[PDB]
């Protein structure tokens, strides 16, 4: 079913955001696991899976709308080297992705692509949940100190 060209372009841009997040959150997860921080491995791994699910929804929607999903262009990752830096990088990526989602959601409404809009709002709610988790962890590092914070990540929850 032919979709709106600019909607398809937004969906491809948001798919690009998810592709960056998939890789960044998966590498962060395995870095945490290598450091013995099993709780952070578990959470970041499941954030990666969530982004994979999002990417799948975009791919399927683009194809239904008769556009070409772009999995070729991968944006810049910002991996980082210690826990706080890694979480702050994930948070900045999420916040950037949320701005793009808000823009796309507004436009999808204007062209009456309400099914695309509805899909994107669900994704946005998911991203706001990741933001909450990231902001909270970063606050916990400040409130309890890094040593105590790291001790709290050794065991699965």
3-state secondary structure of 61: helix
Is the CA virtual torsion 130, 89, 78, 124 positive or negative?
A: positive
Q: How far is the CB of 55 from ligand ZNH (least distance, A)?
A: 4
Angle between helix 5-34 and helix 83-110 axes, rounded to 10 deg: 160
Helix/strand/coil for 70: coil
Residue 124 contact partner, candidates a second copy, ligand ZNH, Na ion, none, CB within 5 to 8 A by sort of partner: a second copy
Is there a binding annotation on residue 44?
Answer: no
Per CB under 8 A, contacts with a second copy among 58-117 are 59-60, 63-64, 68-69, 71-72, 74, 76-77, 79, 95, 102, 105-106, 112, 114-115
Residue 54 interacts with which of Na ion, Zn ion, ligand ZNH, none, CB < 5 to 8 Å by class: Zn ion
CA–CA gap between residue 108 and residue 104 (Å, rounded): 6
Q: Print burial letters for 56-79: b (CB count within 10 Å at least 16), e (below 16).
A: ebbbebbeebebebbeeeeeeeee
Residue ranges that bind a second copy, judged by CB under 8 A: 1, 19, 23-24, 26-27, 30-31, 33-36, 56, 59-60, 63-64, 68-69, 71-72, 74, 76-77, 79, 95, 102, 105-106, 112, 114-115, 118, 121, 124-125, 128, 131-132, 135-137, 139-140, 143-152, 154-155, 157
């Amino acid at each position: 079913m032919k979709g709106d060209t600019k909607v398809i372009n937004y969906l491809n841009k948001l798919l690009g955001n998810e592709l960056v997040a998939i890789n960044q959150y998966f590498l962060h997860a395995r870095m945490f696991k290598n450091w013995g921080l099993k709780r952070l491995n578990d959470v970041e791994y499941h954030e990666s899976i969530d982004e994979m699910k999002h990417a799948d929804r975009y791919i399927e929607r683009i194809l239904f709308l008769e556009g070409l999903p772009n999995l070729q262009d991968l944006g810049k990752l910002n991996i980082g080297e210690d826990v706080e830096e890694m979480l702050r990088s994930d948070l900045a990526l999420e916040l950037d992705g949320a701005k793009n989602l808000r823009e796309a959601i507004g436009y999808a409404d204007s062209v009456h692509d309400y099914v695309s809009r509805d899909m994107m709002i669900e994704i946005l709610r998911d991203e706001e949940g990741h933001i909450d988790w990231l902001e909270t962890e970063l606050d916990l590092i400040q409130k309890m100190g890094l040593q105590n914070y790291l001790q709290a990540q050794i065991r699965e929850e």
